[PDB]
């Protein structure tokens, strides 16, 4: 254990910062899906009537 700490002494801080990053990034991913769908809905929902000239 001690030697593992000696090789990577940032270990504890790194994993806590990673937890914060995971949470924020996941929420941003969820919101980015909502926003993309919101903005794209006029394109996805478009309908056509064709009357050949």
Partner 1 sequence: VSPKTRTSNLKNGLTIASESNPLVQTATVGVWIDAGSRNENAYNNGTAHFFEHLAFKGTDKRSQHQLELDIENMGGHLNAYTSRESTVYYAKSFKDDVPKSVEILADILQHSKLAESAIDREREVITRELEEVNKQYEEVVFDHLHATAFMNQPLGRTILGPRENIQTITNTELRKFITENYTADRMVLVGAGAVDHDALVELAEKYFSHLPSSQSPVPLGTPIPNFVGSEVRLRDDTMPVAHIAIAVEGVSWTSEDYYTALVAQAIIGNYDRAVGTSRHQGSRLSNIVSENNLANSFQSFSTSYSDTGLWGIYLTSENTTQIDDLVHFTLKEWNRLSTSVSNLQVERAKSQLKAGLLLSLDGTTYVAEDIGRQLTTLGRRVTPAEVEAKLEAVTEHDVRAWAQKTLYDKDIALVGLGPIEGLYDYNRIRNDMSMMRW
Ligand X SMILES: CCCCCCCCCCCCCCCCCCCC(=O)O[C@H](COC(=O)CCCCCCCCCCCCCC)COP(=O)(O)OCCN
Q: Which residues bind ligand X (CB under 6 A)?
A: 17, 20-21, 24-25
> Which of partner 1, ligand X, none sits in contact with 39, Cβ below 5 to 8 A by type?
partner 1
**Residue 2: how many CA atoms within 13 Å on its side-chain side?**
0
**39 is a contact residue toward partner 1 (CB under 8 A):** yes
DSSP state of 10: T
* Residue bearing tokens 């806590």: 16
**Residue 9: how many CA atoms within 13 Å on its side-chain side?**
1
Task: CB nearer to partner 1: give 4 or 51.
Answer: 51
**List of residues contacting partner 1 (CB under 8 A):** 39, 42-43
């Amino acid at each position: 254990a001690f030697l593992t700490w000696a090789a990577e002494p940032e270990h504890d801080e790194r994993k806590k910062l990673g937890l914060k990053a995971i949470i924020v990034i996941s929420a941003m991913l969820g919101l980015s899906v909502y926003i993309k769908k919101f903005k794209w809905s006029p394109i996805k929902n478009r309908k056509f009537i064709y009357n050949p000239p």
